[PDB]
Design a protein around this ligand. Sequence first.
Ligand code: HEM
Ligand code: HEM
Ligand code: HEM
Ligand code: HEM
Ligand SMILES: [Ca+2]
Ligand SMILES: [Ca+2]
Lengths: 315, 313
Amino acid sequence: ADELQQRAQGLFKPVPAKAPTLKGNPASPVKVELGKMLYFDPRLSASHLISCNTCHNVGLGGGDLQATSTGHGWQKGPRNAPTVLNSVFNTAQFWDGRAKDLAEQAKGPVQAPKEMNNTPDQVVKTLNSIPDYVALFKKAFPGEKDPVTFDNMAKAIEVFEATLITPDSPFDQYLKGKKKALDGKQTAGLKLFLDKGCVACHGGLNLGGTGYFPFGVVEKPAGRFAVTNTAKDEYVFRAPSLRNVAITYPYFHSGVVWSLKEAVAVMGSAQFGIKLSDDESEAIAAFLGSLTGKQPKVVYPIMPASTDATPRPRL
Amino acid sequence: ADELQQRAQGLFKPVPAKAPTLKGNPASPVKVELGKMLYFDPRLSASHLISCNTCHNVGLGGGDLQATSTGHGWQKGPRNAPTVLNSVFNTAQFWDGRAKDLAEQAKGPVQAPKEMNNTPDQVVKTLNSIPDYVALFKKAFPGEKDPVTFDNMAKAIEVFEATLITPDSPFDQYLKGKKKALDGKQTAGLKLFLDKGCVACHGGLNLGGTGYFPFGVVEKGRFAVTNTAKDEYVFRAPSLRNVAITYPYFHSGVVWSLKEAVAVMGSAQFGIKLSDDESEAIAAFLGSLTGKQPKVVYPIMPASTDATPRPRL
Ligand code: HEM
Ligand code: HEM
Ligand code: HEM
Ligand code: HEM
Ligand SMILES: [Ca+2]
Ligand SMILES: [Ca+2]
């Protein structure tokens, strides 16, 4: 019946109306602003061409519209740039890896050598080179004889991301009150997302983002990609958060599947013992579309100028 | 003595505090928004990674922090990126060419930067896949059967670039009236800038961007000016508004210091001599050319669809 609503209210949870407090990283006005500038400063990279936003494009659903990201040197990477919208709520920091490696973790500072091509110390050199950024670190991180450190730099970055959230997606307004926030097809898709076992791995605050599982997608030797079992190789893949999934194509860790309907079709896997008909993998995908919230209103930061003591671009 | 002010006030002009209306390309709420998303949309490149913001960065004085530009395929360019800020005022359109080459142009191209590796066709096709964009072209150019044209899109991007201006720069304030808007060293720099003939090419509303001259900063201080009338080749005297924050300098971007570049430009060729303190004081002045950097909402850009072509890396 409409038991479905009350049901969903217990498995899922809307995105809070406001950025969550980070532990040991008190968000404040300057801190967010400094983090903002930082997220959008290509000088955090060696070339001075790549920022975070180059690959986690707030204007484009948070990702990079690439199958796999291409960083320094025009090098094509091994992985999809996952969104940065709502990342604040995931605990599973990687796509994939050995189970014995992933096992423990977390939670560390953002590190992007390879993609940005900068050692942490070079990053700290650059920051220290620009006066305005120092005055800014002192304001954001007050008690320190030295605030200009890769940890505080990360804290500030991450406090900005805390605000990159997406409240009131139609589905969130359905979990709140409005039952006709979802439409027929979408509401049909909600039920199938549940009664086919999808919420097992894609559940909670972020519809995923929280756990590792020994299943991944590959090329079939002989519809064209399929979920494989990596239990034997002691490997695991993250079950990504499905929030805003409509706007972050292409899909999976390798970005091999561009169509959202088609990606449902792969996920309705024999390995999890789920069978989907096209109408169900249609309908579900519909509901997936209901998970697109209100995109970030961001004023492009006015970043400060390099001084004679700033390292030159190493392309 | 303080009549120096009226000498400048009759040689320059401050930046208008509201975007200028362009010839047969009127502004409007919806056209500026559309112009914006186009401007931050990387899907105008074959690669899907580069946008007019990749090289003309609102957050860094409308430039790109490089000598010369990269570049689809990570491939360097021939020219330094010039600043988007106040470009709406500059009449002189390219870094450099033969005079004849540039001559017949005014009725011609626009455009498709060969840096982005798309054709005007490929761009058009891309905007025709994204239903939301299509609607915005029809709302922006409301008469027309088919508004999604390359020219209408350059027109959209133009209208929003027109909003990228930098008023209330210390100096602009100085012209507007206030005498003390410039500190000591700046007033001495402005004095010199005139007395040395700097304002001859770097004068006007944009302090340049308005003329061409057979004069090139080339390798040789490592650097110097050269006469190219011989070859019949000419170069842009560029708008030095925001010149404190748009390094490196020159066509090739070979000089990183706003002090070195001021010294390069007190040259034998112009019949000029500058002392360290003099070149150091001119820079001081050129520092006051820096205006209110634009407050601009990062646009939210419509989803791709089945039709939208795939990236070509
Ligand atoms: C220094 C600024 C950057 C920040 C703050 C940042 C942010 C993030 C975050 C928060 C995640 C985790 C996603 C999640 O945990 O749900 C992540 C993963 C990822 N990001 Fe970034 N990013 C930055 C630079 C870049 C750049 C320049 C690229 C592209 C060249 C990039 C590409 C990726 C990729 C490919 C992953 C997946 C990695 C994997 O699991 O193998 N990041 N990024
Ligand atoms: C038919 C039901 C399911 C649906 C509709 C579904 C939905 C999706 C979607 C849309 C993605 C795209 C990820 C992205 O790029 O954001 C995905 C990936 C993923 N999901 Fe599911 N999922 C289902 C079943 C499951 C189950 C039961 C599990 C856990 C046992 C799981 C674990 C994962 C993992 C590990 C990935 C990443 C896979 C890879 O990169 O190869 N999924 N899912
Ligand atoms: C449609 C997208 C773009 C627009 C609207 C745009 C804007 C402009 C403007 C307004 C100028 C002339 C400045 C003036 O007249 O004052 C210019 C020239 C220039 N821009 Fe772009 N830009 C775009 C894309 C790019 C990209 C992607 C790059 C580099 C990777 C770039 C690099 C340059 C360079 C090197 C010049 C100097 C031209 C010459 O060689 O003389 N632009 N652009
Ligand atoms: C000492 C007085 C002068 C100073 C301090 C000065 C300043 C400058 C600066 C800083 C640049 C680099 C602009 C940039 O890349 O954004 C420049 C470029 C240029 N200015 Fe001057 N200017 C002076 C006098 C003149 C005169 C008299 C002329 C014309 C006859 C002129 C024409 C040019 C030209 C042709 C360039 C292009 C250089 C190249 O890329 O080859 N300037 N000027
Ligand atoms: Ca994706
Ligand atoms: Ca420059």
